[PDB]
Ligand binder design. Structure first.
Ligand SMILES: Nc1ncnc2c1ncn2[C@@H]1O[C@@H](CSCC[C@H](N)C(=O)O)[C@@H](O)[C@H]1O
Ligand SMILES: Nc1ncnc2c1ncn2[C@@H]1O[C@@H](CSCC[C@H](N)C(=O)O)[C@@H](O)[C@H]1O
Ligand SMILES: COc1ccc2c(=O)c(-c3ccc(O)cc3)coc2c1
Ligand SMILES: COc1ccc2c(=O)c(-c3ccc(O)cc3)coc2c1
Lengths: 345, 345
């Protein structure tokens, strides 16, 4: 109990109690297709033209205006006022326009699914579980098994992973030091082969194996140098000169990462060979990164409770590599929030 | 498509996609009883003592640390580092300590109920409804009927309304200009009589009627000058020299507010008398309020979609008063986010 610093603390508490409205209002704008409507309009759109296109009832027009102004203050639209109030895209809402260079709208829709995002109401039950991941607590099965049983969820997750894929995959194939001298590579947890296809288009003579769970690669067909193998990375990974792990390790505890890293080391050290493992994931660095960037990485780290995952700093990465028996490593920036890490057995 | 301003826009988009984590992590701290554990400890608590008291499994201790650091950066705890990392309360988390002067933890728990807060996933369906409120869309009945059928929800809502009641009610009873000369007052939507009891303790000769829905006031007993009346404010409000509306009008559309205001005007103009109506609710004022304050009011306005409610600025309030047939009004600051508005028939 202090003076009027209580009103200030109350404002902070309210901001956080209602923070979910920032997520739900953004979801609403994407579901209403507002970014694309504005892009197609070719100029800032008036409130009257917007609600005309949306065909909302007149009793809810004021509610559309209130939501638009809330999203604009957050940076997703720019309000221009003349005879009428109009709404223009911003660089942030341009990221939600279809066919734009980098479109992350599928990420908004995937993450904000009611069941998945609603799982965070159970952080208390989860913190008391010795082994279950947050999704394991709420979905009743592990996440990958869950995707296998729920096609619409699998589609949504794949579209979300695809959404920043071009950017990362092009940054990766532009890294000659990763591919120099390789004759073969296996993309572990390679999905439907998105990364591998870009790799093969770039390096036509390189053999690339897309390795993932049987249900993921079933019925997929490869072609000239690109093949698919269904398996379990905790049991056996195909031999190759190198292993790629893109967005894999941050989905697992340190104990599980050690299991995966041991199987990768085995895969690149068969028949006397001494290959390497290439990892794409975030590297937290509080002293080097710009604060804004560090804050998003820390936020992603908390979000990884979904799979008992983690976003790691350099000392955490180093400790795993050493414990898995790798002799040295190198970290390079790759693109945006991600780094390229190479580890040598 | 621009230069590296894309990475900056991506950081903004991610902040908003995952904003619900700010709400869920705050809910987690209250459910784990962390603010009270720290208060009872009497000093900043070490991570090891905290997880000892919580009895979380060792596999989740790191997750407790990650959540604590995320909440601390948000302002809910202060990290103190010595031989160990320790966590101290802040003015904002002191608002979550039981028996503290002003405790808003019940507000966090009420609002963040999964069903209620989860309703905001349906903003699109709601914006297309001519009449339904957001809660009407998701709960299948109006909110008040819903509380009548769900005791635990009614308890949670009452505890939440009670949480800032002492502060507002004491500010109200200290306003002599409101009570001077009154012989009777009816608190419309008066709940279980929380405000009326403070009014009667202050003004022992004043007659006060607590008026609310029959299920709310059933079995409640009054005493000397305080009585309870069950009814419907849209149909008939008991005559009195004045009507009090605390946190009522912001829960209704302009059309419904006009209906309530007409019934209040009738109640204070019977038998040739010319009484008044006293309203306690927010008044948005972008040019007078500090920006931080305006932002919370605008945020509460968006949140009122739950009941098709609204937080109004002075011109919006004035337009309702005039349309309801009141001749003039006066607005005064009351406490924190609230104003005291008096309207004269
Ligand atoms: N035991 C296991 N063995 C092999 N792959 C696995 C696995 N458990 C999970 N995976 C998978 O790892 C994934 C990784 S998420 C998508 C990853 C892909 N590298 C990309 O960047 O898009 C899923 O494709 C998933 O099926
Ligand atoms: N038709 C109606 N007639 C009378 N009261 C009503 C009503 N519809 C809703 N109410 C009520 O208005 C409320 C107001 S919320 C709590 C209000 C109370 N003045 C306080 O400040 O705590 C509920 O108590 C609710 O039952
Ligand atoms: C493989 O790389 C990733 C990266 C991010 C996520 C992610 O963010 C979620 C997630 C989190 C919260 C939700 O509400 C919904 C989905 C699930 O898997 C993931 C896998
Ligand atoms: C009478 O005054 C009020 C003031 C605020 C609220 C409120 O904030 C909610 C609410 C909003 C979102 C949720 O998730 C849960 C509850 C319901 O009724 C209310 C009534």
């Amino acid at each position: 109990r202090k003076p009027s610093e209580i009103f200030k603390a109350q404002a902070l508490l309210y901001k956080h109690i209602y923070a979910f409205i920032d997520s739900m209002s953004l979801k609403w704008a994407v579901e209403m297709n507002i970014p694309n409507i504005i892009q197609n309009h070719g100029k800032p759109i008036s409130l009257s033209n917007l609600v005309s296109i949306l065909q909302v009832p007149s009793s809810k027009i004021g509610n559309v205006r209130r939501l638009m102004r809330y999203l604009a203050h957050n940076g997703f639209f720019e309000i221009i006022t003349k005879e009428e109030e109009s709404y223009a895209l911003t660089v942030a809402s341009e990221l939600l326009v279809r066919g734009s260079d980098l479109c992350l709208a599928p990420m908004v829709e995937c993450v904000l699914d009611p069941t998945l995002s609603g799982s965070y109401h159970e952080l208390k039950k989860w913190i008391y579980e010795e082994d279950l991941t947050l999704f394991g607590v709420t979905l009743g099965s592990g996440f990958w098994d869950f995707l296998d049983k729920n096609p619409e969820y699998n589609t949504s997750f794949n579209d979300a992973m695809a959404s920043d894929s071009k950017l990362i995959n092009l940054a990766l194939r532009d890294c000659d030091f990763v591919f120099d001298g390789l004759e073969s590579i296996v993309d572990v947890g390679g999905g439907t082969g998105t990364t591998a296809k870009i790799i093969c288009e770039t390096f036509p003579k390189l053999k690339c194996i897309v390795f993932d769970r049987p249900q993921v690669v079933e019925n997929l067909s490869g072609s000239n140098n690109l093949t698919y193998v269904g398996g379990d990375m905790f049991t056996s990974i195909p031999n190759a000169d190198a292993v790629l792990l893109k967005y894999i390790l941050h989905n697992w505890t340190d104990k599980d990462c050690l299991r995966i890293l041991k199987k990768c080391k085995e895969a690149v050290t068969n028949d006397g060979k001494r290959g390497k493992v290439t990892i794409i994931d975030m590297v937290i660095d509080k002293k080097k990164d710009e604060n804004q960037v560090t804050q998003i990485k820390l936020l992603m780290d908390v979000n990884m409770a979904c799979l008992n995952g983690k976003e790691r700093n350099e000392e955490e990465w180093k400790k795993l590599f050493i414990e898995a028996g790798f002799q040295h490593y190198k970290i390079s920036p790759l693109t945006g929030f991600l780094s390229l890490i190479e580890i040598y057995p």
